[PDB]
Symmetry: C2
Subunit: 367 residues, 2 copies
C-alpha cells in the first residue's frame, strides 16, 4: 500500500529499474486543480506499488489530459509502455458508460476514452471513472489489503454493525452497503453496494450533492442562500468550499470581511469561534445528506473520505463536535424506528489517495 | 412467462403430471392482503410455467407464512418436494442480508429465512427479497424474454436513450440504470444498476419513499400535511393511497364527502373534476421523486409498475396529463444541464406478476 510522487523525469528514471520489469497499469487521479498520473504494479506479499507525477490543470480543461498522455508515451521507453496491462483514470464529474465524462463543475470540456492514446489505454481494459467511483474502489482495495483500521476511524458505531459483524467496527468494510461521502471542494458520493446473494461489493456512483435540500427547522437559512444563488439550494451548496464560505458570512454578519474556505479551516484550527461555528454549520448539512441517504440507500456504514477529512482531524477528535454531528445524523422522522441509529459512521484518519488505488483496483477487474 | 392460480388441492394434483418432473423453484409473493405461493418449472422452447395458490394474511402477521409453508409440504407428495432446487419469496418491507425482512407498515412481525422449512427453502439456494427487489428482477426477465414492448409503453423518451442504445425506447430495458417505482398503497422503489464494464444488471433495493420531501413552491401545501401528520412529510405521505385521499380533501375543502383512493381513482376515470385534480397533485409529487432520484441515481430509465398503473392507464394516455407530468419531471435546478431530460419514462401497460417472475429469476442466479 504505497505511492511515490515524482517529477516527470525521475518518474521515467524509476520505471526502468528491476522491480518495474513487471506488468503495469496506467492510472490518473484527475481533479479540478491538478492531475496525478503514473503506473502501478505488485511485488510479493500483497504489495501495492505506485509512482506517479503531478500536473496542473492549466487550461481548466479536461481535454488537456490528451496532451499529457502523448507527452508520456514518447518521452518513455516502449519497453515499459508495452508492459501496460490496463488504463484507468478518474475525473470529477458524471461519467456515462465508463467512456464519457462531463459536464464538469470545475473544468470545461468532455472526457472521452475514444480520444485516448491506446498505448496508455488498451481497448477492453480501459475505463474512465467518476472520482468517487474510483475512491469507492479504493475503499475496497484498502479493505482487501486488511489495512482498514490503519486508514479509517470509527466516529460512532451503529446498531446494526454487531448484527452483521463480530470483528470490531472499523476493522473491515463489513458485509453490508457502504456509503462513501467526500466533502471537499465539491461534495462527492458513492454507494458500495453489497450483494447478499454472492457476498460481493459493487461500486455505484451517485450524485447526492445535487439533490435539493429538504428542510428541518431551517427554512429561513435555506431561503437566505436561495436568494444569493437564485437557485433552490442543493446539498453541495451547503457542503462545499463555497458553502463553508457562506456559513462564515452568515456567522460574522459583516463584522469581519469574507475569507476563503481554506482560510476558514485554518482559523478554526486555531480556535477561532466564528470559523468553528461555520465548520459546525457545514457539518450539520453533511449530516443531513447522511440521514436522508441512510433511509433511501440503507447503508451499514457511512465513511467520510479525502485529505480534507484527514487534515481537519482537530474538528473530529473533539467530542462536543462529534456529539452534535451525531445529533444531526439522527435528525430524521424515521429515527423513531431506529434507521439512522443502525448506521456506523467512519472517517479517513490517515492520508491516502483512494482514487489511484481505485483506478488500479478497477484495472484488475477489467483484466 | 405464464402462470395459473389453482386451489391448494389441485396444485398438488398438477405437480404429479409428468411434465412437472422437472427441477422446481419454490416462489412466493407476499403482500399485506394476501400471499401467492407455488412452484416454477421450465419447459419447451425456453418456456416458463408457474402455478401457485392463494392465502389470506388474516392475522396481518408475516410469521403466519410459516404455517402455509408447512401446510404446503404436508399436504404435498414428498416425491415432488424433492424437486425443489431453489426457494425465493418477496415481502412488502425492507430486507437485510436476503434473510431478515421488517418490520412492515402493512403487517406485524419479522420475516426470517432461518425459520423456514428447508424443503422449500434449501440453504445456499434461497432468499427473501423486498417486493420491489423482486419487481426489479421481474423487469429484467421481461426484457430477456424479448417481450418488453408488450408490457411497457414509452411515456416520453429521454435524451440519453439513442446515445446508449440502438434499439427503440420501450423495446428493451437498455444498458443503463433503470429506476423502478411502484406507486401503489406504498411507494416502492428499486434501482436496476448497470455495471458498464461487465455489461451486467444488478438489482439494488431502495427506500426512496421515506426521504423527506424537498420543497418547490409548495411550502404551504407541505406545512398543511405536516400539521395533519405531526411528521415532516416524506414522498410516500404525498404519493400513496393516504396521500391521494389527502389531495382530494384539499381539493373539496368539505364540499363533498371523503372517500378511499380506490374510489377517487374510479371517480377520475369517469371524469370528476375534483378526482382528476387530486390525481394530478399526487402525480406532481411522484414526478418529484423522479426528478430528485434522476439526479441522485443517474438512471437511463424510470419505469412505473403495478396493477395500479395498468388500471389507471386512462390518466397516462391523456396527452395533457402527460405534458404536465413531463413538466414536473423536469422541474429541477439541475435541468439547466439537461439531467432530468436525459431520462426515459415508461409505464406498465399490461397486467403481469413482476414479483413472482422476479422470485424465479433470482432463484436462477442462486443455482
Ligand atoms: O460535477 C458534478 N458533480 C461532482 C461529482 O461528480 C464529484 O463526485 C464531486 C467531488 O469531486 O464534485 C461534484 O461537484 C456534477 C456535474 C453535473 C451535474 C451534477 C453534478
Ligand atoms: O414498509 C416500508 N417500505 C415499503 C417498501 O419496502 C415497499 O417496497 C413499498 C411497496 O410495497 O411500500 C413501502 O411502504 C418501510 C418500513 C420501514 C422503514 C422504511 C420503509
Amino acid at each position: 500500500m504505497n505511492i511515490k510522487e515524482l517529477s516527470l523525469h525521475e518518474l521515467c528514471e524509476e520505471l526502468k529499474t528491476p522491480a518495474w520489469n513487471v506488468p503495469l497499469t496506467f492510472v490518473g487521479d484527475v481533479g479540478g486543480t491538478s492531475a496525478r498520473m503514473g503506473f502501478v504494479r505488485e511485488g510479493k506479499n500483497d504489495s501495492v506499488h505506485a509512482c506517479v507525477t503531478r500536473y496542473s490543470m492549466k487550461r481548466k480543461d479536461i481535454t488537456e489530459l490528451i496532451e499529457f498522455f502523448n507527452e508520456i508515451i514518447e518521452l518513455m521507453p516502449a519497453s515499459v509502455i508495452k508492459r501496460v496491462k490496463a488504463g484507468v483514470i478518474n475525473v470529477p464529474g458524471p461519467v456515462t458508460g465508463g467512456a464519457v465524462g462531463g459536464p464538469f463543475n470545475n473544468l470545461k470540456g468532455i472526457a472521452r476514452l475514444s480520444d485516448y492514446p491506446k498505448a496508455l489505454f488498451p481497448p477492453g481494459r480501459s475505463a474512465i471513472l467518476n472520482d468517487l467511483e474510483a475512491g469507492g474502489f479504493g475503499v475496497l482495495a484498502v479493505s482487501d489489503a486488511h489495512v482498514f483500521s490503519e486508514y479509517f476511524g470509527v466516529m460512532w458505531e451503529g446498531t446494526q454493525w454487531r448484527t452483521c459483524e463480530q470483528e470490531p467496527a472499523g476493522s473491515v468494510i463489513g458485509r453490508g452497503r457502504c456509503l462513501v461521502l467526500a466533502p471537499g471542494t465539491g461534495l462527492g458520493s458513492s454507494l458500495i453496494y453489497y450483494n447478499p446473494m454472492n457476498q460481493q461489493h459493487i461500486v455505484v456512483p451517485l450524485e447526492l450533492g445535487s439533490q435539493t435540500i429538504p428542510m428541518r427547522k431551517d427554512i429561513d437559512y435555506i431561503q437566505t442562500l436561495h436568494a444569493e444563488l437564485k437557485l433552490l439550494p442543493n446539498y453541495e451548496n451547503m457542503v462545499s468550499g463555497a458553502g463553508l464560505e457562506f456559513h462564515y458570512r452568515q456567522v460574522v454578519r459583516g463584522s469581519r470581511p469574507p475569507c476563503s474556505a481554506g482560510e476558514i479551516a485554518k482559523l478554526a484550527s486555531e480556535g477561532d469561534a466564528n470559523a468553528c461555528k461555520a465548520m459546525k454549520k457545514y457539518h450539520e448539512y453533511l449530516m443531513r445528506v447522511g440521514s436522508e441517504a441512510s433511509m433511501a440507500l440503507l447503508p451499514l456504514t457511512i465513511v467520510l473520505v479525502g485529505d480534507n477529512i484527514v487534515n481537519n482531524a482537530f474538528f473530529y477528535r473533539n467530542p462536543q463536535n462529534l456529539k452534535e454531528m451525531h445529533r444531526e445524523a439522527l435528525n430524521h422522522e424515521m429515527e423513531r424506528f431506529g434507521f439512522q441509529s443502525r448506521v456506523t459512521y467512519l472517517r479517513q484518519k490517515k492520508l491516502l489517495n483512494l482514487n489511484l488505488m481505485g483506478c488500479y483496483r478497477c484495472g484488475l477487474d477489467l483484466s
